[PDB]
Scaffold this motif. Structure first.
Motif, PDB file in Angstrom:
ATOM      1  N   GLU A 252       3.469 -34.223  -5.730  1.00 49.76           N
ATOM      2  CA  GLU A 252       4.522 -35.191  -6.017  1.00 49.76           C
ATOM      3  C   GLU A 252       4.050 -36.618  -5.758  1.00 49.76           C
ATOM      4  O   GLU A 252       4.218 -37.502  -6.611  1.00 49.76           O
ATOM      5  N   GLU A 253       3.471 -36.863  -4.586  1.00 46.53           N
ATOM      6  CA  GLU A 253       2.997 -38.184  -4.206  1.00 46.53           C
ATOM      7  C   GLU A 253       1.876 -38.689  -5.103  1.00 46.53           C
ATOM      8  O   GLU A 253       1.640 -39.900  -5.150  1.00 46.53           O
ATOM      9  N   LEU A 254       1.187 -37.796  -5.813  1.00 48.30           N
ATOM     10  CA  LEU A 254       0.186 -38.205  -6.785  1.00 48.30           C
ATOM     11  C   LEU A 254       0.788 -38.454  -8.154  1.00 48.30           C
ATOM     12  O   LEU A 254       0.451 -39.451  -8.796  1.00 48.30           O
ATOM     13  N   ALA A 255       1.677 -37.578  -8.618  1.00 48.69           N
ATOM     14  CA  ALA A 255       2.373 -37.830  -9.869  1.00 48.69           C
ATOM     15  C   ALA A 255       3.176 -39.121  -9.829  1.00 48.69           C
ATOM     16  O   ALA A 255       3.438 -39.704 -10.886  1.00 48.69           O
ATOM     17  N   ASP A 256       3.566 -39.580  -8.638  1.00 47.93           N
ATOM     18  CA  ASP A 256       4.311 -40.828  -8.524  1.00 47.93           C
ATOM     19  C   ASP A 256       3.423 -42.053  -8.338  1.00 47.93           C
ATOM     20  O   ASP A 256       3.891 -43.176  -8.559  1.00 47.93           O
ATOM     21  N   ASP A 257       2.159 -41.877  -7.942  1.00 42.64           N
ATOM     22  CA  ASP A 257       1.281 -42.998  -7.606  1.00 42.64           C
ATOM     23  C   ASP A 257       0.101 -43.133  -8.563  1.00 42.64           C
ATOM     24  O   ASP A 257      -0.095 -44.192  -9.167  1.00 42.64           O
ATOM     25  N   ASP A 258      -0.692 -42.074  -8.710  1.00 38.43           N
ATOM     26  CA  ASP A 258      -1.919 -42.087  -9.506  1.00 38.43           C
ATOM     27  C   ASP A 258      -1.931 -40.794 -10.316  1.00 38.43           C
ATOM     28  O   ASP A 258      -1.992 -39.700  -9.748  1.00 38.43           O
ATOM     29  N   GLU A 259      -1.900 -40.925 -11.642  1.00 37.80           N
ATOM     30  CA  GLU A 259      -1.763 -39.771 -12.521  1.00 37.80           C
ATOM     31  C   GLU A 259      -3.091 -39.252 -13.053  1.00 37.80           C
ATOM     32  O   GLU A 259      -3.177 -38.067 -13.392  1.00 37.80           O
ATOM     33  N   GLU A 260      -4.122 -40.094 -13.149  1.00 33.25           N
ATOM     34  CA  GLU A 260      -5.417 -39.593 -13.597  1.00 33.25           C
ATOM     35  C   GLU A 260      -6.012 -38.610 -12.596  1.00 33.25           C
ATOM     36  O   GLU A 260      -6.659 -37.634 -12.994  1.00 33.25           O
ATOM     37  N   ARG A 261      -5.789 -38.838 -11.301  1.00 34.15           N
ATOM     38  CA  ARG A 261      -6.174 -37.852 -10.301  1.00 34.15           C
ATOM     39  C   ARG A 261      -5.363 -36.574 -10.448  1.00 34.15           C
ATOM     40  O   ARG A 261      -5.918 -35.469 -10.390  1.00 34.15           O
ATOM     41  N   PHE A 262      -4.050 -36.709 -10.641  1.00 35.03           N
ATOM     42  CA  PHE A 262      -3.178 -35.569 -10.879  1.00 35.03           C
ATOM     43  C   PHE A 262      -3.544 -34.807 -12.140  1.00 35.03           C
ATOM     44  O   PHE A 262      -3.132 -33.652 -12.289  1.00 35.03           O
ATOM     45  N   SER A 263      -4.287 -35.428 -13.050  1.00 33.58           N
ATOM     46  CA  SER A 263      -4.766 -34.752 -14.243  1.00 33.58           C
ATOM     47  C   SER A 263      -6.115 -34.091 -14.041  1.00 33.58           C
ATOM     48  O   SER A 263      -6.303 -32.957 -14.491  1.00 33.58           O
ATOM     49  N   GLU A 264      -7.057 -34.763 -13.376  1.00 33.54           N
ATOM     50  CA  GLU A 264      -8.367 -34.152 -13.187  1.00 33.54           C
ATOM     51  C   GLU A 264      -8.270 -32.966 -12.233  1.00 33.54           C
ATOM     52  O   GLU A 264      -8.797 -31.888 -12.524  1.00 33.54           O
ATOM     53  N   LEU A 265      -7.594 -33.140 -11.097  1.00 29.10           N
ATOM     54  CA  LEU A 265      -7.257 -32.010 -10.243  1.00 29.10           C
ATOM     55  C   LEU A 265      -5.765 -31.727 -10.341  1.00 29.10           C
ATOM     56  O   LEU A 265      -4.967 -32.596 -10.694  1.00 29.10           O
ATOM     57  N   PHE A 266      -5.399 -30.487 -10.022  1.00 29.14           N
ATOM     58  CA  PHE A 266      -4.107 -29.916 -10.403  1.00 29.14           C
ATOM     59  C   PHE A 266      -3.983 -29.816 -11.919  1.00 29.14           C
ATOM     60  O   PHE A 266      -2.905 -30.016 -12.483  1.00 29.14           O
ATOM     61  N   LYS A 267      -5.097 -29.508 -12.583  1.00 28.02           N
ATOM     62  CA  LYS A 267      -5.102 -29.399 -14.037  1.00 28.02           C
ATOM     63  C   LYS A 267      -4.523 -28.066 -14.495  1.00 28.02           C
ATOM     64  O   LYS A 267      -3.709 -28.022 -15.425  1.00 28.02           O
ATOM     65  N   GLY A 268      -4.944 -26.966 -13.866  1.00 31.42           N
ATOM     66  CA  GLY A 268      -4.434 -25.659 -14.238  1.00 31.42           C
ATOM     67  C   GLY A 268      -2.943 -25.512 -14.044  1.00 31.42           C
ATOM     68  O   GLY A 268      -2.297 -24.780 -14.801  1.00 31.42           O
ATOM     69  N   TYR A 269      -2.381 -26.202 -13.052  1.00 27.72           N
ATOM     70  CA  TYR A 269      -0.935 -26.199 -12.880  1.00 27.72           C
ATOM     71  C   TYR A 269      -0.244 -26.773 -14.105  1.00 27.72           C
ATOM     72  O   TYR A 269       0.788 -26.250 -14.542  1.00 27.72           O
TER      73      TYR A 269
END
Ligand SMILES: [Mg+2]
Ligand SMILES: [Mg+2]
Ligand SMILES: [Mg+2]
Ligand SMILES: [Mg+2]
Ligand SMILES: [Mg+2]
Ligand SMILES: [Mg+2]
Lengths: 159, 169, 294, 72
Positions: free
Chosen positions: C206-223
């Motif tokens: 959650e704290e990544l989807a709200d702050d930095d999304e490219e990280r949330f895309s490179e990791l947590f990709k399979g989710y």
RNA sequence: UUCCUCGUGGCCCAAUGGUCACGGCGUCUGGCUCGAACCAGAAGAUUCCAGGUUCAAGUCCUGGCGGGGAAGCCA
RNA sequence: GCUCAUGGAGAACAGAAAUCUCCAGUAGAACAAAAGGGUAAAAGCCCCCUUGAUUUUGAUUUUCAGUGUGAAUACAAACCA
RNA sequence: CGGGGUCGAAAUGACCUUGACCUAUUCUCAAACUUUAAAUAUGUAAGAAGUCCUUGUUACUUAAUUGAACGUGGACAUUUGA
RNA sequence: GGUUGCGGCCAUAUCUACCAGAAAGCACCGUUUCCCGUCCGAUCAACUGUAGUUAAGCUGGUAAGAGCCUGACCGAGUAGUGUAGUGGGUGACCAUACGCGAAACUCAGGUGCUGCAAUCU
């Protein structure tokens, strides 16, 4: 002054070994000792707890008690004109089974097998061991083995 | 061949060996604090000499260890002082190197007169990827010779980077 | 030149055993672990061996013998997809589930499965598997973390917690779980229950989807690829626990092949030793060439 | 030298014998053996004593030394 | 031979295991008046030799060397 | 948790010896003291917590008369770390 | 990178002398050194108080009639164990 | 047969220098919000298994390789030693008889074997 302490004259005996220093392998601790088992005593110098006196190095005894980390061994000790029984509480690092009893019990069950096998026909097993007998007659051939004659050699310096 | 046997900077160690403890050491510590953003570590003496004036365990030096982009930043800031010129003696046979500077006011620490003047002994440790094989606890191993850092490799690295040159030999 | 060792050195050198060279075994610890009270004569001492590789957790129940250790049950993380966990196969919650799985597995094969059911309604509490009256005195097993650090929040103790909640009696204190306050030496169950189900992962998502999304895309990709949201993480672990308690009986793989079919290619591929006559000829050739005036 | 040692004998107590050795000087090899090893290149002089080639060891070193043995 | 003790600037002597060592005399420089005395000031040490103990040895431990001293009795 | 003596190669003042970095290093170091044994993810060095250097009496080994003392060993029933 | 001489201004400079240190060799030794290692002396064992099979007791032990110890009952006799 | 986890015997397994490495696995590797620990997320901890790489580690092979192991009518039945003699020898010591019996050296060969569980073209 004189000196007769517990570990007197143990320099080479409680030495560990050449290229076998350090810790002890786990088979010493995974071996199992029951009452009546025959055990030889060989002190490890790296385990200072539960050691035997130098007198009992190379002595074979019978287990009389078993505890958490130790084993109770009975030994026969010559004191003057008689033998006294001695009870040691030895840690198992200083303890290994004697292979003589295993080699005797293998022969026990082998003799039982032979007796049961040859009682089916009654052929006088004769299970006792016997000493090495004198060797029987035989014939020695010279076919390809003609005698090679020898002679004493003279004296030379060889330096 | 050469996929990932690149030479990165493992760490940069800044050292200041004061011959005394007290306020001079505190000020030298406050130097490295503002320089690195980290808290430095004071280092004791090992034995007395009576000539340099040190007692055993008398807190004579202070150092700090930097890693990552901050390390190469401070290394650029120090090579500017050194005019991008280094002796060949300054490179060790294991691939690491170092240099010293006087008057840290050459950068950053302009004066802040409560602190004073101090030199530094920069030392830069070079390694390739896969070096934790020596540092980890489990299955600790030794790095292979093909993968080891060397003087001839790190001077070539230090020349193709920073566009610098090396002195006598 | 400088890298040279003398014949005296190499002749006097005593090697560490083998696993000490390989850096895999602390024999000072194995001594204390496997050594049994000699009055419990052949009673085996059982270790919960928990090991962590990259991309896998390994949990085994192991006893010791003179010819080699022996396994009762084994449980890995790469078989959790059976129960519904495909992502985070090394995390704290997957360690919990691996411990629960091996606990229920060994209990099932021993017969201690209807009794000592364990803790079904997880609450983050500190409780040991207690012995039921007129009962069989639950199975006892001791951790072997190996060369891993005893540390607060470490995920070897998650496997410990799971094996405890599954019905195994694993002796332990609670001062290495997450949620343990150091100033006031007591335990907080809420953080521990969140760690069981992935709160320390969902909160980061959650704290990544709200702050930095490219990280949330490179990791947590399979989710993202499989439609898993932060709030969808508690339910899948809760359901995996139930599936584990239902059928932990170790369905293995089909193996796709036979041992000989697998070995044929590897034997074709594996370099082999050189005979003595070949060695002598290989040396004679070098004599005739390098010493025979090339 | 036989006379020099026969004169030395008077300075010692006991019985001392004078022996002509079958070896080559201070070597452990007989005369013809040393000769048939020096006709080939097994032998390499030092300051006072001598080094012998072995059929054991690395071949690079045994050719770096004793090349006269391999140049057959 | 045994035992005890001492070994320190050119000389005499001292020292808490804790500054490459106190004092006095001698020497040197300058001054007062030509020289002494006197007033100011300086320099000079591998603490007998060879080893070790401690973060540190002049000192703490062993042997040698040299100086001195005590003992060497019953017959 | 870490690995020592020592050597080598390097870094301003800093040199034979201050502090820092790396490589090698089966112990060539340390473990109060005499010597000898023993010890390397320790028995050594650093750090955290402690008082099991506690209670109750018994048995055993050494010296040995199989007496005592001293020292040590392995257990039992507690209480603790 | 010890101490000397020569070309030498010196040089992380050279030619030579002597020491230490390194490498491979060489001669000789150890009551209080040793990888190795006897001969003689020394401990134990070579069965009925033994072996095997079956299942009984326990407050010990075990995840557990699992083990430990002691047992009941049954089989193996004079070549009964060199 | 390869690999991993846990091992047993503890160099036939170590050491030096090179070479090679399908698949999978191990590994390096990427990130710092959380538990956690550091002068430093280097070690330790946690997250991801996603962005890449067999370069290293790991496995195996190579070497008239060092070391280690085994064997031998190799040395040598030598040295040494128990027992015996109104044996020799001024003695020191030495022979002989009935027995036991090495080490170095030399030569030759070898350079990890194996257990439980899982997984792999
Ligand atoms: Mg011995
Ligand atoms: Mg531990
Ligand atoms: Mg004057
Ligand atoms: Mg420790
Ligand atoms: Mg007594
Ligand atoms: Mg015998």
């Amino acid at each position: 002054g004189k000196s007769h302490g517990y570990r007197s004259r143990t320099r080479y005996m409680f030495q560990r070994d050449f290229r076998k220093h350090g810790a002890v392998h786990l088979s010493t601790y995974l071996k199992v000792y029951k009452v009546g088992d025959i055990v030889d005593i060989k002190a490890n110098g790296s385990i200072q707890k539960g050691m035997p006196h130098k007198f009992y190095q190379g002595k074979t005894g019978v287990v009389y008690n078993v505890t958490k980390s130790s084993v109770g061994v009975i030994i026969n000790k010559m004191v003057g004109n008689r033998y006294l029984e001695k009870r040691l509480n030895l840690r198992v690092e200083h303890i290994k089974h004697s292979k003589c009893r295993q080699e005797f019990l293998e022969r026990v069950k082998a003799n039982a097998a032979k007796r049961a096998e040859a009682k089916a026909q009654g052929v006088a097993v004769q299970l006792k061991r016997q000493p090495a007998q004198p060797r029987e007659s035989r014939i020695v051939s010279t076919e390809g083995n003609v005698p090679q004659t020898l002679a004493p050699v003279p004296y030379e310096t060889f330096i | 061949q050469n996929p990932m046997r690149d030479l990165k900077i493992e760490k940069l160690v800044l050292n200041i060996s004061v011959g005394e403890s007290g306020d001079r050491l505190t000020r030298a510590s406050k130097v490295l604090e503002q320089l690195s953003g980290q808290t430095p570590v004071q280092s004791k003496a090992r034995y007395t000499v009576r000539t340099f004036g040190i007692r055993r365990n008398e807190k004579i030096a202070v150092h700090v260890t930097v890693r990552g982009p901050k390390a190469e930043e401070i290394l650029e800031r120090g090579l500017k002082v050194k005019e991008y010129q280094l002796r060949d003696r300054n490179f060790s046979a294991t691939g690491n190197f170092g240099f010293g500077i006087d008057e840290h006011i050459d950068l950053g620490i302009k004066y802040d007169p409560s602190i004073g003047i101090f030199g530094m002994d920069f030392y830069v440790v070079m390694n390739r990827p896969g070096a934790r094989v020596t540092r980890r606890k489990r299955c600790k191993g030794t790095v292979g010779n093909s993968h080891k850092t060397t003087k001839e490799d790190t001077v070539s690295w230090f020349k193709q980077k920073y566009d610098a040159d090396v002195l006598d030999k | 030149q400088k890298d040279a060792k003398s014949s005296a050195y190499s002749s006097r050198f005593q090697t560490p055993f083998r696993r000490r060279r390989e850096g895999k075994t602390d024999y000072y610890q194995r001594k204390r672990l496997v050594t049994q009270h000699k009055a419990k004569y052949n009673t085996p001492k059982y270790r919960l061996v928990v090991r962590f590789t990259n991309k896998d957790i390994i949990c085994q129940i192991i006893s010791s013998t003179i010819t080699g250790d022996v396994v009762l049950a084994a449980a890995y993380s790469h078989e959790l997809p059976r129960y519904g966990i495909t992502h985070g196969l090394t995390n704290w919650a997957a360690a919990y589930a691996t411990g629960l799985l091996i606990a229920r597995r060994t209990l099932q094969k021993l017969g201690l499965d209807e009794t000592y059911k364990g803790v079904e309604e997880v609450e983050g509490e500190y409780e040991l598997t207690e012995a039921v009256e007129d009962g069989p005195r639950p199975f006892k097993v001791f951790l072997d973390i190996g060369l891993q650090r005893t540390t607060t929040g470490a995920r070897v103790f998650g496997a410990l917690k799971g094996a405890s909640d599954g019905g195994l009696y694993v002796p332990h204190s609670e001062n290495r779980f997450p949620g343990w306050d150091f100033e006031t030496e007591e335990i907080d169950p809420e953080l521990l229950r969140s760690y069981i189900f992935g709160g320390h992962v969902s909160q980061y998502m959650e704290e990544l989807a709200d702050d930095d999304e490219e990280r949330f895309s490179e990791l947590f990709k399979g989710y993202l690829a499989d439609d898993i949201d932060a709030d969808s993480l508690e339910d899948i672990y809760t359901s995996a626990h139930e599936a584990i308690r239902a059928d932990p009986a170790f369905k293995p793989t089909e193996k796709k092949f036979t041992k000989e079919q697998y070995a044929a290619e590897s034997k074709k591929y594996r370099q082999t030793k050189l005979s003595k006559e070949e060695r002598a000829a290989r040396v004679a050739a070098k004599i005739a060439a390098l010493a025979g005036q090339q | 030298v036989v006379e020099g040692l026969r004169r030395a004998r008077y300075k010692f107590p006991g019985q001392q014998k004078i022996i002509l050795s079958k070896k080559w000087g201070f070597t452990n090899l007989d005369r013809p053996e040393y000769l048939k090893k020096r006709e080939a290149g097994e032998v390499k002089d030092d300051g006072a004593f001598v080094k012998f080639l072995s059929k054991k060891g690395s071949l690079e070193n045994n050719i770096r030394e004793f090349p006269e043995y391999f140049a057959a």
